[PDB]
């Protein structure tokens, strides 16, 4: 829950003489360190298969780096979450350079707008959106128009000293 890395977690049920070689399951988990990621792996597995980590084991844990960490992409994000009064699915879009960058703004946004802390959200799917205008959401489409430019009116420069011998301007 912080500056996110994304991990492959791969686990399985412990072998039995009856079933050596039990099936392997993978999740992609966003977390900040690997102790959290494996926790998170088990949290989800327990809600999906009978297994507690006391009957299972983690076979591999590997960080998945962004393939094109400077191509700008538009991501579709699918999320399940709890409100003070129920639980909701929700599709949002995020424009960024990496999943890991996108996911982090997802979490800030769920916090800002819906007052959803991390314990309350599940990431359902995160996906680069291939064709522009499969993009559904205005506030990301806006950036997709041709020869896009804008000013940044009213610039405030931070001052290094407490007094200034001239009245400042906001001119950019």
């Amino acid at each position: 829950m912080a500056h996110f890395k994304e991990y492959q977690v791969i686990g399985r049920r412990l072998p039995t003489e009856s079933v050596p070689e039990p099936k392997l399951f993978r999740m992609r988990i966003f977390a900040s360190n690997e102790v959290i990621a494996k926790s998170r792996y088990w949290y989800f597995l327990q809600k999906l298969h009978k297994v507690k980590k006391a009957s299972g084991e983690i076979v591999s844990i590997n960080q998945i780096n962004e393939a094109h960490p400077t191509k700008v992409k538009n991501f579709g994000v699918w999320v399940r979450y709890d409100s003070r009064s129920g639980t909701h699915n929700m599709y949002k879009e995020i424009r960024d350079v990496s999943r890991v960058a996108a996911v982090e703004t997802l979490y800030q946004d769920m916090a800002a707008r819906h007052r959803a802390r991390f314990r309350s959200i599940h990431i359902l799917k995160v996906a680069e959106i291939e064709k522009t205008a499969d993009v559904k959401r205005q506030y990301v489409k806006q950036f997709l128009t041709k020869d896009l430019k804008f000013p940044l009116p009213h610039r405030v420069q931070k001052s290094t000293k407490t007094f200034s011998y001239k009245r400042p301007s906001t001119f950019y």
Partner: protein, 159 residues
């Protein structure tokens, strides 16, 4: 006012097991008891004589006496900040050899034996139990078991 008779609070404790009321099978009368045996006490409420008071239900002690129809049992009971030694005269219907003293004796034999084959080979033994150990490295293969990847699931009502 309040009420604290001898069998107070015992409605579920002295009750017979579901579909197990009635005559007590003869095995109970065929067990033999020796001074120094370890028995577990558990009341049979169908036999009202020779009956442990309810504090002793579920407790295990040592046989200190053997009689026509009962064994005497020594229980150590805590009263205050100190155990007091208590002796009970239970009829046999209410008593049962402690099964763990049996594993124990079995292991003592097993132990003597392991020691024997070890000496009559002149090798080291290692006779005491270790607890469950951490787990050694493995290589899991992927032949036929390419990992299936799962994701969390959307909320939904089933009502």
């Amino acid at each position: 006012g309040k009420s604290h008779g001898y069998r107070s609070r015992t409605r579920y404790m002295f009750q017979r097991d579901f579909r197990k009321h009635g005559a007590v099978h003869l095995s109970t009368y065929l067990k033999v008891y020796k001074v120094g045996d370890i028995v577990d006490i558990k009341a049979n409420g169908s036999i009202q004589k020779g009956m442990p008071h309810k504090f002793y239900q579920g407790k295990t002690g040592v046989v200190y006496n053997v009689t026509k129809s009962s064994v005497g049992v020594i229980i150590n009971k805590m009263v205050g900040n100190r155990y007091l030694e208590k002796r009970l005269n239970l009829r046999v219907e209410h008593i049962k050899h402690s099964k763990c003293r049996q594993e124990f004796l079995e292991r003592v034999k097993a132990n003597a034996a392991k020691r024997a084959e070890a000496k009559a080979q002149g090798v080291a033994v290692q006779l005491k139990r270790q607890p469950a150990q951490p787990r050694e490295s493995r290589i899991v293969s992927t032949e036929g078991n390419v990992p299936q990847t799962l994701a969390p699931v959307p909320y939904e009502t089933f009502i």
